[PDB]
């Protein structure tokens, strides 16, 4: 239930192959503590594109306080940031800029697509809009919504957090397997279908 990805220069220039989990208990504890340190301090990239960025900075404020998860540093350079949040629409003019900003980031990096625009092009099935950000970069966590509410962005942040907590990365570049292992977790749809179906009644829309 794991996928091995390696990059070696149609985009992206990487291939995914289904590989079983190899995971020395010392190396396992080291990987767990490395993943814990990586997931408890996620440094996003300040990338202002569209509406979904405005809702992202609405998540970034005091009334929501995404700072509680250690995700508030918000570096303006792609080198200093770990996470790329594509919070907007992938226009044809802005697609190479997005690709370059993704390229200048460094391993480890993660990608969160925010909104229907970054998910699949969304409501703008138009000549100047690229239908989805996954056409040219890999995506880790998708969020639907136009815009997704801020608490949904924190929900995707926790989703990426336990995605990071169960993945295997090389500790050093001089010893070990350099390929990136990502767990094929069970999706939230059939996981939440156990209690989504049992919903019977909701509050009527004539009240506050």
Partner 1 sequence: MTLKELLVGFGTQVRSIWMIGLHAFAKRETRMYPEEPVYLPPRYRGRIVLTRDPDGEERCVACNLCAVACPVGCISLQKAETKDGRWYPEFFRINFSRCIFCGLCEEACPTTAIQLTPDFEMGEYKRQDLVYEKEDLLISGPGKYPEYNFYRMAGMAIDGKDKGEAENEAKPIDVKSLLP
Partner 2 sequence: EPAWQTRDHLDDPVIGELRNRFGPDAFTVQATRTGVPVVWIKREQLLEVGDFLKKLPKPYVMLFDLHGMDERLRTHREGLPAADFSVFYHLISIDRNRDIMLKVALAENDLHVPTFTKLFPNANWYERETWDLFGITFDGHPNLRRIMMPQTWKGHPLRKDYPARATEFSPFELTKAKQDLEMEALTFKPEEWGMKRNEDFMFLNLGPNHPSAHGAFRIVLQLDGEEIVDCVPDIGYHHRGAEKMGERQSWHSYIPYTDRIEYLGGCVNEMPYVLAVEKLAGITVPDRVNVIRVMLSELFRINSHLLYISTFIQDVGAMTPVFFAFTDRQKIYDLVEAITGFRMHPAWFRIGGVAHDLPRGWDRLLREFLDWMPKRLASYEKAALQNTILKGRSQGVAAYGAKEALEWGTTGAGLRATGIDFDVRKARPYSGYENFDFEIPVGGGVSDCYTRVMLKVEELRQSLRILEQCLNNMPEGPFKADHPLTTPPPKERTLQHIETLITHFLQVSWGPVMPANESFQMIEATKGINSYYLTSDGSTMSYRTRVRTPSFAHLQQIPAAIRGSLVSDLIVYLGSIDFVMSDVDR
Contacts with ligand SF4 by CB under 6 A lie at 50-52, 88-89, 115-117, 122, 146-147
Question: Of 80, 85, 84, 79, whose CA–CA distance to 104 is shortest?
Answer: 79
Q: How far is the CB of 80 from partner 1 (least distance, A)?
A: 25
**Read out DSSP for 119-178?**
HH-TT--STTB-S-GGGTS--SEEE-SSSPPHHHHHHHHHHHHHHHHT-B--S-SSSS--
Tokens 């639907």 correspond to 144
Q: Does 100 bind partner 2 (CB under 8 A)?
A: yes
Q: Which is nearer to ligand SF4, 51 or 95 (CB)?
A: 51
Q: Which is nearer to partner 1, 5 or 120 (CB)?
A: 120
Instruction: Specify the pairing of strand 14-19 against strand 2-7.
Output: antiparallel
Q: Does 135 bind partner 1 (CB under 8 A)?
A: no
Q: Which is nearer to partner 1, 95 or 139 (CB)?
A: 139
CA dihedral sign, ordered 134, 139, 141, 146: negative
Q: Which is nearer to partner 2, 63 or 174 (CB)?
A: 63
Stretch that binds partner 2, among 18-26, 62-70, 157-165, 180-188 (CB under 8 A): 62-70
- What values do phi and psi take at 109, rounded to 5? -135, 150
Residue 3 binding: pick among partner 2, partner 1, ligand SF4, none (C-beta 5-8 Å cut-off by kind): none
| Cβ-based neighbour number of residue 164 at 10 Å | 22
With residue 2 as reference, give the H or E element that holds it. Answer: strand 2-7
Q: Residues in the site for partner 1, rule: CB under 8 A?
A: 62-65, 68, 116, 119-123, 125, 132, 134, 139-146, 148-149, 151-152, 154-156, 158-159, 163, 185, 187-190, 192-193, 196-205, 207-208
Q: Residues in the site for partner 2, rule: CB under 8 A?
A: 10-11, 46-51, 53-55, 57-58, 61-64, 76, 88-89, 91-97, 99-101, 121, 123-131, 135-136, 146-147, 149, 205-208
């Amino acid at each position: 239930d794991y996928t091995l990805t390696r990059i070696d220069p149609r985009y992206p220039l990487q291939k995914q192959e289904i590989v079983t989990d190899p995971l020395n208990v010392f190396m396992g504890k080291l990987n767990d503590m490395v993943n814990w340190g990586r997931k408890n301090s996620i440094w996003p990239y300040n990338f202002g594109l569209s509406c979904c960025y405005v809702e992202m900075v609405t998540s970034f404020t005091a009334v929501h306080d995404v700072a509680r998860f250690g995700a508030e540093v918000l570096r303006a350079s792609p080198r200093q940031a770990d996470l790329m949040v594509v919070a907007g629409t992938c226009f044809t003019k802005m697609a190479p800029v997005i690709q370059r900003l993704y390229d200048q980031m460094l391993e480890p990096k993660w990608v969160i697509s925010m909104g229907a625009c970054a998910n699949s092009g969304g409501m703008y099935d138009i000549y100047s809009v690229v239908q989805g950000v996954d056409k040219f970069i890999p995506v880790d966590v998708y969020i639907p919504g136009c815009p997704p509410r801020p608490e949904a962005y924190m929900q995707a942040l926790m989703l990426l957090q336990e995605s990071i907590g169960k993945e295997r990365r090389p500790l050093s570049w001089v010893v070990g397997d350099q390929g990136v292992y990502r767990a094929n977790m069970q999706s939230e749809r059939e996981r939440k279908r156990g209690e989504r179906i049992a919903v019977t009644n909701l509050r009527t829309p004539d009240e506050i």
